[PDB]
Amino acid sequence: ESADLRALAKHLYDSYIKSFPLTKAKARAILTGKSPFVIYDMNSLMMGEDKIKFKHVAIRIFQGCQFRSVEAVQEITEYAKSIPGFVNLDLNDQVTLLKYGVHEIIYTMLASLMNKDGVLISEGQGFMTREFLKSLRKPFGDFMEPKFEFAVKFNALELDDSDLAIFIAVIILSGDRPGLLNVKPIEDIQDNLLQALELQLKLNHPESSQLFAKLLQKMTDLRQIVTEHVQLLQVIKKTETDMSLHPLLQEIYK
Amino acid sequence: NPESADLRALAKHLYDSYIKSFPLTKAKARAILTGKTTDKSPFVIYDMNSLMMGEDKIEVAIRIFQGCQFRSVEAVQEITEYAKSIPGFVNLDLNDQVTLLKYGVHEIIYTMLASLMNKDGVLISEGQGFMTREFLKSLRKPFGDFMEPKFEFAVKFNALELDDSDLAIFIAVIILSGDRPGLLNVKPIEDIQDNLLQALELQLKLNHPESSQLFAKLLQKMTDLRQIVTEHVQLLQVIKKTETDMSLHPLLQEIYKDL
Numbered sequence: 001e002s003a004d005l006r007a008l009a010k011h012l013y014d015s016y017i018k019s020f021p022l023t024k025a026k027a028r029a030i031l032t033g034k035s036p037f038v039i040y041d042m043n044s045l046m047m048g049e050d051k052i053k054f055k056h057v058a059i060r061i062f063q064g065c066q067f068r069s070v071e072a073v074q075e076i077t078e079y080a081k082s083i084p085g086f087v088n089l090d091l092n093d094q095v096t097l098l099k100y101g102v103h104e105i106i107y108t109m110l111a112s113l114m115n116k117d118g119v120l121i122s123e124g125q126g127f128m129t130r131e132f133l134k135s136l137r138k139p140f141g142d143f144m145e146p147k148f149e150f151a152v153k154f155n156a157l158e159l160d161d162s163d164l165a166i167f168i169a170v171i172i173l174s175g176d177r178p179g180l181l182n183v184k185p186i187e188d189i190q191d192n193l194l195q196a197l198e199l200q201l202k203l204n205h206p207e208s209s210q211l212f213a214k215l216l217q218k219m220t221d222l223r224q225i226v227t228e229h230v231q232l233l234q235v236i237k238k239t240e241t242d243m244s245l246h247p248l249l250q251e252i253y254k
Numbered sequence: 255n256p257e258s259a260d261l262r263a264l265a266k267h268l269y270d271s272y273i274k275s276f277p278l279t280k281a282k283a284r285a286i287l288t289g290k291t292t293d294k295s296p297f298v299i300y301d302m303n304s305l306m307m308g309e310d311k312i313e314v315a316i317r318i319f320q321g322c323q324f325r326s327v328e329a330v331q332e333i334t335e336y337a338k339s340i341p342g343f344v345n346l347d348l349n350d351q352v353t354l355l356k357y358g359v360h361e362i363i364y365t366m367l368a369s370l371m372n373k374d375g376v377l378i379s380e381g382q383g384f385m386t387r388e389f390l391k392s393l394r395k396p397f398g399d400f401m402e403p404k405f406e407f408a409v410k411f412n413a414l415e416l417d418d419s420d421l422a423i424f425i426a427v428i429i430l431s432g433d434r435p436g437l438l439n440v441k442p443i444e445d446i447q448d449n450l451l452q453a454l455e456l457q458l459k460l461n462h463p464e465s466s467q468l469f470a471k472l473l474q475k476m477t478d479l480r481q482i483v484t485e486h487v488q489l490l491q492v493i494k495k496t497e498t499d500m501s502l503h504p505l506l507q508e509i510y511k512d513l
């Protein structure tokens with residue numbers, strides 16, 4: 001029966017490449033060796049915007065992160081709709097799985113762009129450092145540090161795009177999202193996704209023992225930082241006197 | 255097969271210490287919850303009257319919470335005894351044995367508490383009593399919602415149909431976690447958890463053969479345990495600042511100390 005598990009592994013990987021432009025393999029090449037722009041202080045921030053083409057002082061960084069998250073949701077939605085059985089679910093269930101899922105996949109693939117010294121920005125064309133992300137006014141000065149502590153641990157598992165492709169699918173098909181209407185089949189697809197993930201990590205990582213069990217424990221983490229960032233997204237709602245400009249622009253970021 | 259036999263010896267050793275460390279197991283709790291015995295029948299507490307009459311074995315809202323933390327201290331004592339029997343735990347650094355226990359005990363307590371709970375209430379007083387879920391939820395604020403997260407997780411967790419032999423290994427995996435803040439020597443802990451995870455995977459393969467992917471579905475429940483600890487922690491901070499005379503316990507207040 002593992003013939004179908006190997007089929008599903010490459011089907012999800014091929015769709016992973018089409019839905020996501022900047023893959024982990026191409027981000028690892030940029031982080032080590034061609035070079036992009038480096039934003040390390042306040043001068044290189046303004047210097048960046050000139051020759052980088054952004055699409056939007058301390059709030060300009062956060063608003064750009066929400067612009068990138070909106071583009072990410074579209075890539076995650078298109079990728080999820082290619083998972084076998086996803087589009088054949090209840091349309092309300094598909095909306096719910098994506099609603100409570102995109103935040104966890106955003107940080108999983110964000111780690112693919114992070115090391116211990118910074119993160120890539122604007123499709124690998126730039127690079128914001130770690131210390132510059134702790135030198136902003138509150139509460140911006142400490143909303144990326146939990147995500148850097150997580151990216152260090154998660155990337156230590158040292159997975160590739162084919163492992164991540166299956167791992168992304170399992171997070172979307174989580175059958176415990178509040179408000180589901182047909183919890184059965186969602187757990188059915190996630191059951192075969194977990195089999196394909198268990199098989200994938202054995203054939204690609206034969207030396208690392210219980211990489212499948214250690215990967216599932218990172219989900220326990222993942223949600224703890226998603227629910228922590230959610231409660232931080234309402235500190236920006238109540239603080240800063242510059243987080244409400246064009247009303248049509250507020251509707252996009254929901 | 256010779257290496258899988260080494261994992262069976264580990265599984266039987268953990269189950270042996272489990273029986274010897276926790277007096278009330280899930281096997282005995284299910285014999286009490288389901289009314290199949292004429293001798294292990296509990297006195298049900300459902301209102302104020304059944305409370306004062308069942309006082310032979312056990313402010314109302316405060317008195318209920320005092321006994322909850324009294325049993326929590328009883329639980330930590332049993333968890334520490336069982337952790338010492340896990341192979342390698344006592345061989346680690348003494349600072350790490352305290353940190354693995356500091357963040358691990360509550361995730362263990364809510365796991366085994368689910369063995370004493372059905373959808374209608376919780377076993378209390380060593381199985382002699384049974385406090386209803388409605389009465390626990392009918393307590394005044396902020397105590398009227400102190401138990402619903404525990405109950406909602408139990409009916410979800412008990413669906414896995416795990417017995418004490420599977421629970422023994424899953425308890426050991428939670429204690430020997432490398433993801434806990436303050437671990438000085440992380441790698442020697444990850445080696446022990448790797449051995450416990452191999453034993454748990456084989457245990458569920460043999461004890462639950464028809465149940466597919468029970469190993470992955472069980473490891474996902476650790477995400478539920480974290481949110482209960484965080485919601486619990488948030489709730490004590492409100493009680494500490496409202497009931498100013500409400501005093502804790504050396505075992506509990508030092509676990510919540512900058513958790």
Ligand SMILES: O=C(O)COc1cccc([C@H]2OC(=O)C(O)=C2c2ccc(Br)cc2)c1
Pocket residue numbers: 305311312314317318319320321322323325376377378379380
């Ligand atoms: O004392 C009162 O009137 C109300 O407080 C009570 C009432 C009943 C039982 C107890 C405690 O004693 C025990 O043996 C026991 O397990 C207690 C207990 C406390 C909280 C939860 Br949850 C489960 C059990 C305290």
